[model samples]
Every structure is written in structure tokens, then in C-alpha cells.
Target chain A: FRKMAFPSGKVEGCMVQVTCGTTTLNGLWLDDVVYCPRHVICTSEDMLNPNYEDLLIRKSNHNFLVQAGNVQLRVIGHSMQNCVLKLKVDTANPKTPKYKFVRIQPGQTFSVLACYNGSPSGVYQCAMRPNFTIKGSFLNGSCGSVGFNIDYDCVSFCYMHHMELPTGVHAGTDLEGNFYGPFVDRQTAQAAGTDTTITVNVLAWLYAAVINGDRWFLNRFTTTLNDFNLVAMKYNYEPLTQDHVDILGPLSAQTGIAVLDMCASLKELLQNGMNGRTILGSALLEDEFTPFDVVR
Target chain B: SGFRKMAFPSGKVEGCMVQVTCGTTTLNGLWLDDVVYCPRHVICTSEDMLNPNYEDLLIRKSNHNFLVQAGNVQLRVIGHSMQNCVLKLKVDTANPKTPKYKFVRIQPGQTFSVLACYNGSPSGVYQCAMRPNFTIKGSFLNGSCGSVGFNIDYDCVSFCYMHHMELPTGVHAGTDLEGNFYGPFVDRQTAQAAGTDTTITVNVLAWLYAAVINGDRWFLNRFTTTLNDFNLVAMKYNYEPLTQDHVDILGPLSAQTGIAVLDMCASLKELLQNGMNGRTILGSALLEDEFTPFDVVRQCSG
Candidate 1:
């Protein structure tokens, strides 16, 4: 994954209000710097890719807390707004050893304990506008989903992307938990470039994209190019197995991925450094992500 | 799905399973044994003060002795019958007049509200007793069957209200002659009466001062405690958000000159107020254990 180039036109600032029945939580996200109320859980120093696994959640129950893992969407009474909620991440270990999160509730009488086994999809919702609600993705797509709970717990998937040329910006997310662009004009219900301007593979937002053209691999499902390259570049003891082709074929259906012989010979160059879910997150650090590419 | 009936086949084996296909659609349902009909009973699990935890009390007669699970069973107009049941949300605490909510209706999906019913702060326990009109498979309708109703009880602490107490810098040598500096001394009686079970969002600016005895030493000129260096709570040269856990876990570790020092004797406000207060090492001694050469009390101004 390529580290996000600072002030890059590809990335933009985004804000959305989360809801549980009716309570709204507003926050801003820019270049992987996620701001909830005021705390920057994901700092600019790191890419929001792996860090995206750790979501910033607010639980309003008089006390404050921080929870992680396969959280759920819950139902809540109206009085839930009376509670105060905040989110905290162990950013100390953002990029390495193992991507993980610990419970921290200011270490009170009770701690940040488990709250659920939220159902898939319909459990949580995210809205660009209060009126337009998108069901959350259980899959954790390339775009991050912000978790919220009302009666039980819920979450809405989210992500950031650049608009068409002229350097404008646009950010959006969907139930599939992936990102797509050339900004589909919602008003016209059609494509603008359908992007006559420079082409961009929004599918690359969560997976890996080959820079040569509009091609990407469904890295999340099969092994990643980043991991595949490690073994391919060094050890050729094992040839490309049919298992590799099996996963490679269908994932290539939507331009989300498109490749084969490269992995066979270990000579694939990604659109961006083969680091994060996509190139947008790759821009987050100075790690020199573009120096290489691979899929896992 | 419109009303339709389908008869299920049996007698292959005691533990065999089957899936039926209607046209291209495969309908989903489970096959149960002839006896032990619908053994699954609804029961409330755990709870939070603000959120409600509920389990389904579902049973729909599929015809002759068949049961299907559904939740909207409460919309009825009749009196108590074999199908009717009662969900008693009872509280166990010091308060006597505390009401035991009895939703004696058709369905039993409703749950006990811990926020409203749980009186007497600090902590309490409650239960969701399922009282069926007739025998519920394994109960004492006959002698030696066991207990009457079923109890799905849960124990939890009362909701803790937040208190924003801004701690002022204390410069003093207490009567015990141990240096006193940190958050305010939380009075026990006051904390209990106010139901201040926990302290959070506290901002403290502690000024560390070390000395030969209880008096100030030359290190006071520049030495100050570090905040967030080792994830400790309380005051230091800078502002820090402290939690009772940090105070108890970190135990007020500070830097004296260039050396890292730990205060073996620091009393937490929450712990002391709850009568669970215990020191890290020796009692009432501000001196660092590993550093002190002799009796700390004799050396300090005590």
C-alpha cells in the first residue's frame, strides 16, 4: 500500500452523523485521521487500512467506554441519548506485531466489556444525509464501518475518496462494505465519466489495484498480494496451484481484481504500494508503499 | 407468507434430520421428537442500567401438540389460562416497597428494567422469574419435582453517576508527617450518600517534591511528575485524565530528580470510601521503599 501523499487531491475530509433510533454522532475523517467529537483515534502518521479494523464507538450510559471486535447493532430506547459515549484506540500498536484493540473505559468500576453478537447487515445504518440511510456491512469491506448501538448495538460502513478532477472531493460507503467511484451522480442516477475524466478504480479502496490499468484483486477473501509477494519473490519452491486460480478467477469479475500469470511468475506491479486495503490508505504514511505491489 | 399447512414425516431414526424441498424453494423448519415437546424456555440473560436484555417466550400451537417460536404473544383479551404466563421482574435489595413488576399476560417477551426497578445505589441484584400457568416440563407440580417457578437471575452493580471534582494542588506535610499531594481526600460518608461509585474525566496537575525528611528538597526546583509516560493516573507537572483504575494500578509512580520512584503508600479515594482501601507496600509512608535506607517515619517529620 502506498502512503497517502499529504495534501493529495485523491483524499478528502468527510463527516457523517451516526444514529441509533434518532441520536446523531458527528465526526470528521481526513487522510486516515478519524476525529470523533474531538479525539483523533487514527492519527495522520498511520494509514487507516489495518487501523480501520479498530472503530471509534460512543456508548452513552452515564459512563464512557471503548470496545472492539465483531460488535453488533442493537435496539435502544429513546433515553439512550442521555448517556455519554466516547471511543479510544490503542494506536500505540497501529501498524505492527498484530493489529489489535484493548478495552479502556477510563478504568472505572466497570470496564469496556463485550456488548454483543450483532446480526449481519441490517443491524446498523450510516447516512450521508439524515434521510438517506445505508445498511451496515457485516463484512468490514474496504470502507470502514462506524459501530453504534441503541437497544443492542449497530454500525454503518464508511470510507473516503477523491471526486472527479478540478480537485473536488467526495466520500461515501455502502452495505457491500466496499468503495466505488467516478462519483455516480446520485441526482441523475447515471455515470458522469460515467468518468470521462481520469479513471479511478474505487474497488481498489478496500482491496489491491493494479496501477497498469483498471484492475484489482479481492485481496480480503483470498490471500493478499502483499503476503503472496513475500513467498513468491523469495521461495519458488511451490508453483501456482489451481487453488490460487480458483480464488483469482471469480474475484476478478468486477474489476475488483484482474490478474494471473504475474502471480505465477511473481512479477506483478500494483497501482499503488501493496500495503493497505487500497491506495488511499497507502498514502497515510512515509513507508514508501509504491516501491512494491502484491496481493494477499 | 400466507397461511398454509405441511405435515412432517418421522420414524427414520431417533436422531436423524431431514430437509424438504417445495418446487425450487427449500422451506426451513426444524423436526422435534414426539416427547420432550419444545423444551426451550425463554429467560432474560444479563443487563445494563440503560439497556434492556430480553429473551423470547415463544410458543404457537402448530395443531396437535406442535410448537413454533414467535414473540408477539401479548395481544390477548382473556384471563389467565394454560397458555398464559407471568414474567416477574423482582428486585432483591434493602428497600421493601420496591415493586415487583408482574406482567401477567399472554406472551412473556418483556424483561425487567434494571434502571427503574433497581433502588438503593452502589449495587444490587435482580431476577426474571418465569411463572407458567401449568407444569413447565421439569417443575414441582407433583411432590419432589423441585422448585415452583423458574428463576433467571442476574447480579450487577447500580448505575454509577459521574462527579467532576477538580483537584487543586495540595502543598502540605500531613499530621502523619507523610507528604500529601494528589487528588482530594474523598470523604467516605459523603461518597456513599451521594452514590459516587466511580470517578472519571478527572484532570490533575501534580507537583512532585522530594526531600530528606518531610521538608522540601533541592529537587523541587525543576523535577515534576510525567503524565502518560507509563499510563499512570493523577497529577504531575502536566494535566492528565485519571481513572480510579490508573490510581490503583499505577500507584502514583513519579520521578525524583533523575531516578524513577514509586509511592508504596497512597490511598485511593474510591477504594478508601468503599472500605476496600489497601496500600501498595508499607502503610502511611510516602517514602519509596526501594530507596529508603531506614525507618521512613522516623526520618520524616512525623
Candidate 2:
């Protein structure tokens, strides 16, 4: 896993009196480097696919036995604001491994033990909230579900020509547990292809696209790719997988041609390579087998 | 009370000759024969009587009298009308070479069952055994005939075996779901006197002390203490009735020790006024476990 510095920010006694929408932090000094765990690019091909199935990005909400500790807050791009976190002590685990959780104030900092049965993996921002009710305060309601696939890698699936998203990002292995793109838009949704966007209670429409397009096999792959691809303006690329975001800034503008197209082009490149052909010679082939096979 | 029946399947054989061994012990060879049907009674016999051996008439009852054989053995006897009885049959007790089973033996592991109960009911505990095997124990209630049998299959610890042990007389039939249970106390007011209340508390404490003394029953203590873990009691005084089981199983005197762990207790101020002429409660004073009043001791500066 590529290690990145987690960005730090300050939250001064923020309060959410309402029970709806997103929790915004304006004055927060979210200036520190975010040391997020990046996708592991195996220099040795042997290490590339080893035990990738065990990788998970979601952490469950557990009753934390909070003593005194520092808890960093994490949040994702598209998420709900209403979530009531109650600190609880539970004997369900070894010797009451579950303990006190202070209700998070919108951006307060309190520590928590990691997820018990895999949870809280994707995007979460921590805050200090009071449990005991105040005179003019309402209780924080329920925490809506967040995207579970944020902290995973794309295994054999990478950028291609159809990378605008929707129909582009395809799952490879047909493994049951893997997830593909949190695509860019509904168009990218169709183009940057994926198996389906898993929502806990909501119905998903991408299921048909995934099932019909054979992106279901991408999920069958043996490895889990746990990195993010931030499309910068040019070839200036950030290392989403291996923690080196330093390279992302001024790369060629042509490189960010939608993750879907990149993925499709790579798929073509790989088929040619597997057929005993170099990417250089076959990429220039107009009467290539794939092109002809596509038309046929 | 349900049905009174008896059986002696083999022909008019001597009752003493036909031994009754619940597992292995003789219980009483011939001496115990009269114990079953009393001493000197007009016992009806079949025409195949070989000798004056009353055992033959008793053992081979089926062939003798039709009613006494398959049904109830109606007889009026004196003395041993309501005692335990064991029936046995011998095969080769006198042989030395093989030394095989000359009589039925319901020992520790063998299996045997109650054939029938005639006349009076069976009291006390009754279990069947065939040589070494022991069947489940059942009891016949007052003035009733009961039956029991050994369950050959399944482990003994299972409740199924206990369920199978038929008790026609249900004095001690159903199991004690709450084993050796005692107490449904709501509070001390409904209890006996102050001494009785204290005794009840002490009894509960005794149980608690016993449990804590031996930690293997800590689960029992926890089971008992769980009520206190929840705020079930309104006052600290109310805690005793609810917490008695914990105190009984795990001994910890649940008394107010007056130790100032928290100064909020109203009773603490009254206990520590050491003859001081003022209403001045002992202020910021600490005491050790030496059992001496602090005001009486004066220590010289070291």
C-alpha cells in the first residue's frame, strides 16, 4: 500500500443544530498532507497480485471503548451529513473491546479503534460532538451510508479510450466481492463501464450494464486495486496507488483522456501483447485483429 | 395411580430362584423376597408348584394366576408394603469354568427396567440397572404404581433421557428446572422482622461469599449480580432484595462501609463525630484500618 500523509485540519467547536444535508467545515485548517494508503504497484510481478482479495476499503461503525486518544476525521466527495454516532461499551468482543464513542461535532477530533468487521474504509471525516444534550441542540440522527469502494485498486483494470467513465471501467475477474468505478457521470456511467454501484438501500441501474458488458468478470479478478486516479490537466500525474502525489501536476494534456478510453485502449494493447505482439508495432496496425474483430 | 401391573414370564419358578439385581449387587438374595410382598400372606400359586418354595409362586406368576400375571397381583400382606424392590434372574451362578451370568445383574453400566408395579406405590428414588449399566432414576409418588426403564441410546447428560424415564407416579416426576431455588423477595418490609431481614441479607451474603470464595461458580455470581448492573433498584436499600442472589452465591457483605469513597452519603457525617463539643463534622480527616479512634492518638513530630 502506498502511504500518503493524511491532511490535518482544525475544527473549533462546530455545531449542527439541524438534521439534514452535508456537514461543511469552512474555517478548518485542512492544510496538512493527507497520508492516504495508495494502491500497491508491485515492482516484482509476483508481489502485484498476492492476496489482493483480502484488501478492503470499508470499515464498519463499531462501538469504540474510547479512553483518551486522537481521532482523525475522513470524508468522501459525495456523502450524506446526518449521522448519529453514539459511544457505547459492548461486551460482544473480547473483554468489552467496544467502548465509549463521543458524538462527533461536525469536525471535532476524537480517536476510534478501526472497524471490527470491515467498515468505515472509504470517506469519513471525524469531528468532536457531545453526547449529553445541550439546551438548544438536537441529537445527531443516523449516519447515512458512504461509498464502500473508495479504498480499493483496479487490479488488471486501468485507464482506456472509453474512460469518460460510465461504460469504460470494467471489472476483470468475475470475483464476487470486487467493485469497479464510481464513474464520473451518467454518460461516463455508460461509457466508463462498471459492474454496479452498490448502495445499501437504493436500487442500482448499472447492474444491467455490468452484467451485459461482461464487466462482471472484472470483479472475478484475483487482485484488488486500491488506488484513486485524480485526472489532472496534463501528463502531470499523481501516484494514486503508491503514495507519490508529487508527480501529478504538469503532465501532457492528452494523458487524461477519460479513464474509460485509457482502459479500453489498454485492453486492446494487452490482447495484442498476449498474441506475441509489441505495443509499438500493433498500436499502429490499422488492420489489426482487434479492429477487424470489432467490426466483424 | 394410573395402572397397577406385574409380570413373571417364566413358568411357576421360585421367586428366590429368579433373582432381581438392579445392576450388580444382590440387594438381598432370598432374604429380600418377603420384603416385596410382605411376610406370611395367602399368595395364590399355579398348579405347577414343585415345592413349598414361595419364590416359584412369585416368579412364575404369569402362568399361575391370569390376573396376577399380566395385570395387578392382588394380595393383602403385612409389613413391607411400601419399600423398594429389585427383581433378578440367574443363568449360571454356580458354574466355575465360565462363571457366567447366573442371575440378572443391573450393575453400573448394564440396562434394566421396571417391569410393573403391583399393590402399593414406589416411594424414594428408583433406577434400573442390568449388571453394570444404570438407567435413569424415577420416583413413584404416594400410593401409586410407577414404571421406569433404561434408555440404551443417546448420552445420559441430555434432557431427553430424563424425559424418557417414565414416572407413572409423578411425585418427583418433572425435573427441578430451578435447582435448589430459594427466594422471590421483593423487599425487606414484606420480609420477617429486622433480624429476619438481616438474616435474609446475611443468607444472601453467605451465598455470595461462598461463590467468590470458590471462583468456578463465578458465572452464577454474575447471573445474580447482573440485576444490580442495571439500575433496577430505586434506592440503595432496595438493592438488597434484588442483589440477594448475588450475595448468596458470591459472598461480599453488601453493607455500607461508611468509607468516604464518596462524601455524598448523609450517614457518614453522623458516624465520625468523636465527642467533639461542636456540630463540626470530622473535616478532612482520614482513618486507617487499625480500629482506633483518631482523636485519642497524639503523635509527636518526627
Candidate 3:
């Protein structure tokens, strides 16, 4: 998730916190985060399918200034060539919507500028659309990974800004034999401006405890074949065999990368404010790091 | 003013030709267009892309033509090696809200229609198809039918998603399912549901599975309670094994059949292999955008 902090009345140094609670399956975190300006949008657990990019676009466009950060793309069983990472800003044009496309190669850390045309100064829409195809076979039979980090662009930032929410929520159990809070998703604080009061908290699912504290920073997540089987049918799909895994290996790998990227974005937001600068306009001056917004 | 100096405001020296280099390439006609460019900036490099950021621009050489109203330039390539190059085209974004399609709809009998005609020589005119150039042939007794030319998976998805939100007169299927939840989901009549309800259930299931799928016994216990006690059908652990129909759907029993556990292990192995390679199924389209002839290079490895 994305986060940023601003200084309060007494504290000289403002602290922004971002917390991400993730569940790893078979050494893989299918969930990932993508950062824009205002929100860090997360992809669902199944981003290997072609529709994953569409979901990212849809979620980011629902609201403005949502971007992907530290996010990763997965290609199951193939090598990616000059890839185009497109971010659609306005979709009114059936053929030509307001969007940005960036190039990326396989096995590289990449990011893109996602924006819509004619986006107002206030909240805006941002998203990442990685368009690529596979050319090789996956050794594991499955190929894909997770992604993270995205910012919701905020105009004239201040304290009392909304916590950067992850695209969707996750559900899992705690150690004490009870279902804990649905793992909340968040984005980095890159959207935060300078000089504001915003507190960031990392929600960590350690063992079985949903701790909203800083002690445990949620990083990578994984599961085994056995663990995967537990919820296989629950998702309405038959258990994938080792052969399927081989075929999907590349896709799974990319999904894992996305997951790690999301964690990185969250960490960055918690440590640093989202927006690097503040906007002081006609009416009033606002903190660059704060999430609050005023007409001034 | 004779053509003393030409300016390439669009900023690409590649793919662009001067009046001297006359050829049948897509850039042939553009070479004749006059422009103003500094004498020093004759050669174009990818670096120009960075010097002047490409955003919110509509027809750099000309003004006012934004989005659909502006003509789009596409580099068309023929033959096999055409996939090797990436042709970048700048789109004008001044008027982004203009509707690109004058009339969008499926003809009574047919599905899609041609929206544009790119009249270029050598090759026939190119037509840009509608956004969703799909045809609905007919609805079966139960609303399931076969699609002739394209992937049925996509057709099925479209059908399910675009199914009329409201059913016919007697059909009460406008996402008001809470009151209608009493009956068993035996048929479409019983399965009438709310739009948000279906999506929410899907969302909750995905969330729960995301956590429970991991090796978390504690999470599993909670899942068992939510699913078992709540009587949520999503938590049902029953597997119909391999019915004759299932075998038929998957494949010949020997070809598709195996213990579920064994198959899952194989998927995991592939996952590791793919992770190391840094490639995935979704990366292909991204690569295509970088190709010179994005539409022509379909033979790249998968």
C-alpha cells in the first residue's frame, strides 16, 4: 500500500507510515502493487491471464491519480521483447483513449508514466497496462509474478489525506484459529507532499497475527503444492499439476515479482512521503507530504 | 520559400523520409509534407523522446487536431522479418473526449463493422475494426451457444458480462438477490442474481483463498468456519472427481486425468522455472508494442 507522513504540532520530523499485509503461497505472492501519483493499485492473485492488465486499467481509472509502482509483470513460459506498458487516462475514445505506453524488456525493473488526457488538477486516474506476449515454454509449466507500489495523485496535499488503499482486500486466517481482519492493501506515499502530518503503519501478517505495527515488515509470501491444494477447488479450478506449474512457471514468476514490487512501494511510502513537493496556490499553502486537502 | 530547411516537429528522423527518399513505405506520403527544423537537428535518436516528453500532445507539427479527430500514423510492414523494428507514432491528445466511432453497434445479422479505410497503395485499404467487433449469432435454449471463428472463452465472457442487467417482464434478475436467495440454483430462473452480489462473492472468495491458499493452518480454520458455518457455497470442499462430462471437457481420461495433488506439484515447479526467466504469459502484449510492426509480428515465441 502507498503512504506518506507530515509533521504534526510538536514533532519536527513528520512520519508517514504504509503497511501491507500479504499472504504468500508456495513461495509466491500472487498479489502485487502498482503505484501512480495518488494510489498504489494492487492486482488480484491471478494477473497471469490477459485480463490482468485490463483489471489494472479499470481499477486505476475508477479514481484519479492512481498509479502503479514497484510493480512486476510475469510472462509464463516465454521471453518478453520490447513490451509496451500503457497507462490509460481517459477512455472516452473507443479507439484513442488518453493513455501512455512505455517500453520494457524481460528480466528488467521497469516503470511507466500513467495519465489521462485533460485530467483536472484534482484527483485523477492512473494505471499501468503492460502488453506483451510469450515466446518460450515455462520450465515450471506456470509463469507469472506479483507487483506492488503505486500512488494516487493528490492535488494541493495536506494532512488528513486518505490512506492509500490497495486495489482490493485479501482474506486469510490468523494463528489463533480465527479469521483475522481482511488483509488491507495500500500504496506508497509518493503522492504525499512536503511538510505534513501523516502516520504510516505496515500491516503485517506474522505467522497468524494481523499486526498493524512496524516490528514486522511484510515482504515476500509463498506456498507449497500441499498448501495450494487446500484452496484449489475453492477457486473453482482443479488442482494444477506439476506439469501445469511448469507451463505456468514463467507467469507465476512474474506475479511474484509484482508482489515484491508492491512491498517495496509500501516500504518507500512509509519511510518517505508520497508527493515530493507541495502545491501552494491562490488561496492557501498546503504540505507536500500531507494527505489533507483544502480549497486554499 | 523553397524547401531550404525542414523541421521534424514530431521529432523522429527514423521511419521519416525527406522528399529525396521516395518509396512505397507507410512514410512515403509524409516525406512530402513540409516542416521547419533547426539545421543541426537532422538526425533523430531515441534520446529525442526524452528531451521533449511525449504527453498531452496532438499533432506536434500541426495544432488543434486532438485524439480521434487527428489522423493516426501506423507503420505497416509485410514479409517475415517485419517484427524486428518498432515504429513510434505520436498521437494528438488535445480533444481526448471526442467519440471515435460515429455509430457503434452489431448489425442485425453480422457482428462488427469497418470504422476506417486506410487507402495506401501496393496493399489494399486497411480497415480499423470496431472496439468490440463481435457478433452474437443466437442464444441457445439455455443461453449457451458455439462461436464460429473466434475464441469461445472471450465470447463466453462477453456474453456473461453483457447479459442484460434486467431480465424480461416476469424475470426478476436485477441484482435483487437477497430476497430471492431462498430457492436452490437449479436453473437460470433460480440463479437470477444481483450484479454487485456476484462480484462481491467473487471478491470475497478471492480474498479468502488468497490467504487460505498459503500454508496457514490458522487461516484455514477461520476459512472453514466462514464457509462451513456461513453455508457459503464458495467454501464447499466437494470435488465431483471426474465425471464423464468432466473427462470429455478436459480430454481423454488418460490425457487429462491425474491425481489433483500430482498435477498441482507440476504447476509449482513451472512457477519456479518461470520466475528465474523473468517472463510470463502477460508479457507478450507488452513486447508487441515495442515491435516495429506491432500487428504483423505474431510469430514471436510464446
Q: Count the backbone clashes (under 3 Å) in each candidate.
A: 41, 138, 172
TM-score of chain B of 1: 0.16
- Shift in Å, residue B200, candidate 1: 14
Better of 2 and 3 by TM-score: 3
Which numbered prediction scores highest in TM-score against the true structure? 1
Q: What is the lDDT of residue A115 in candidate 3?
A: 12
lDDT of 3 by residue, A113-138 (tens): 11111110011111111111111111
- In CAPRI terms, model 2 is classed as incorrect
Model 1 gets an lDDT of 0.21
Tens-place lDDT digits, model 2, residues A1-296 = 00011111001111111111122111101121111111111123423342322322121222111211133332222111111122122211121111121122111121111111111111121111122111110111111111111111111111111111222112110011112232221121233221221110000111212222313212221211221222211212212232111221111122332333322332333233324332211112111111111111
Off by over 4 Å in 1: A1-238, A261-296, B1-224, B228-240, B250-302
Which has the higher TM-score value, candidate number 1 or candidate number 3?
1
Worst 10 residues of 3 chain B by lDDT: B1-10
In candidate 2, what are the lDDT values of residues B1-302, reduced to their tens digit?
00001111110111211112222211111212232211111232223222334454455443122111111332222222211122222222221212111222221222222322222221111222211111223332222222222221111211111111222221122111111101221111122211111112222233222222323122221112233333232133322232433233221122322122112111222222222233221121221111111101101000
Which of the two, 2 or 3, has more DockQ? 3
Per-prediction share of native contacts kept = 0.00, 0.00, 0.00
Q: Kindly indicate the candidate among 1 and 2 with the higher TM-score.
A: 1
